[PDB]
Amino acid sequence: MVHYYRLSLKSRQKAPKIVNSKYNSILNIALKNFRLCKKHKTKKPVQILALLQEIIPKSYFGTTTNLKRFYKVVEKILTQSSFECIHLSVLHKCYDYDAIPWLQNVEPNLRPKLLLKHNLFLLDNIVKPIIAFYYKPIKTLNGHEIKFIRKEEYISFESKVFHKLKKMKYLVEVQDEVKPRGVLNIIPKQDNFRAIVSIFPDSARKPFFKLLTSKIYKVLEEKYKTSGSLYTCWSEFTQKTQGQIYGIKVDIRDAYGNVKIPVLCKLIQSIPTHLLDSEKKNFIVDHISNQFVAFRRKIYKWNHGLLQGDPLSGCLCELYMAFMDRLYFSNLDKDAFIHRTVDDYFFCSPHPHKVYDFELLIKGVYQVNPTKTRTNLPTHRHPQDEIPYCGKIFNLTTRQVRTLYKLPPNYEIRHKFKLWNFNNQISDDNPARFLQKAMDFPFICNSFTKFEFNTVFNDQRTVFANFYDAMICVAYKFDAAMMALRTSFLVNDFGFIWLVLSSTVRAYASRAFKKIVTYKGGKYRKVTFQCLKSIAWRAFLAVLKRRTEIYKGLIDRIKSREKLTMKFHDGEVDASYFCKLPEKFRFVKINRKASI
């Protein structure tokens, strides 16, 4: 029931020195050259595609066309998304068997199963081992993007920060062979790093941490006031306040690191025992008071607040903060608006000084990330009217809220979609299920919420541009799914794709009706079912034109007619925004090419 090959490096095996007796012995030539390659110092930067060429004999493929086929896969590995797969079927389908010298002697009907396992063998024992030999994959947490870094480069940074963390007494090496709970990892961010712990999956102790986590969330919702609902807080405050809003979003740097463990331990003990048993209280207290971590064959103690990566760290930091909130922000104007996440505070009032004071009140208590601070206060050095917060972009003047998109310039957008599922594999002769699973709704739902489609505080200018931006995204996902159909399913019948295409602009457009209509408000003008299906079909237009040659046929019949009149009842929806591509998505790389 296994159709898929996973691209990621840790699926790699460790190469025998000699090839097994069911494999043809041209392979042993390759393994020998593999060792010779590893003994090369390789101080200077070198491409993997180039290094493999001088390892795998041309004599193994015969023709250059066969070889480029196999390089299309190495490149995919070198450019992989987390979880990305290919079909095992590609490893052999459509090859020029004639040109393969060592198969003339093997019966034709026997050849494809020899080539798949020989290509599996080369991929598992030579290609990934070598990539691993020179680099480390780190996941950027922008979608599933994985960046590869040179081992000499990463190691240097690792040791560099490790020495800092050893200087700053955050990490202290002791001698008791106390059990470490996980392995520390140093993963670089924008300017800093992130020290995190990977918990050894514990021996049936996770259920215990699940239980404790729920039990303290019960104390959070109880002895501490609710922090709002965000959608309702921003609804009410924009109605209670009619003048120019003033606001600030501040980003605390290292919320975990700046927790005072002692206080947290006193909060723990302070719980009523009908709520939290004294034994459990004490388990958390020496759990977070004794955080031990394995580095390079050494076990250290973590004492800078809470360990990112520990299962308790989240909820325990929540408790800490909720208690702080009581201390410092309970008395604020009732009319003003305030909402917090884990380390992101958003505060709005119609008076400049109340926000300015809030900035001071917060700075007296916390060390913040000053570059991350955003404000419309006129005496700030870079004031703005739009504040990013919580995955949304609030405009304090207009009071219109958009979705926030995390797509750096040259981000390869295929990294924002997990199209492969290894627990539920799709056949190579069933591309229809591979293009529909791509099209499941749940993936854009977080942009199909009361927040984006309501017309309570939102114009129609903005309830439109929202739905339009969401659909640009579903398009890019469609394009990535297509090139997975093209490059892994290898389909040439593009007739069973239009089905789910229009079969989702209908449901995709209709959902915006029930969700958009249930949250009507005083800026609601008039929206229309085919106004939405037309926005949708013009979004696909503006996107698909980026690979016009593969797609003009589909855009030819689309553009031709379709009644793209684009009449809008409001009149202040420019509608120019809909023809073309919103600036965010034009500068995203849609092609796949391994840099090194």
Add this chain to the structure above:
DNA sequence: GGTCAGGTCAGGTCAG
């Protein structure tokens, strides 16, 4: 057969 309540999964958003 038609609801609910609970459980799982999936892909996505938050945020460490």
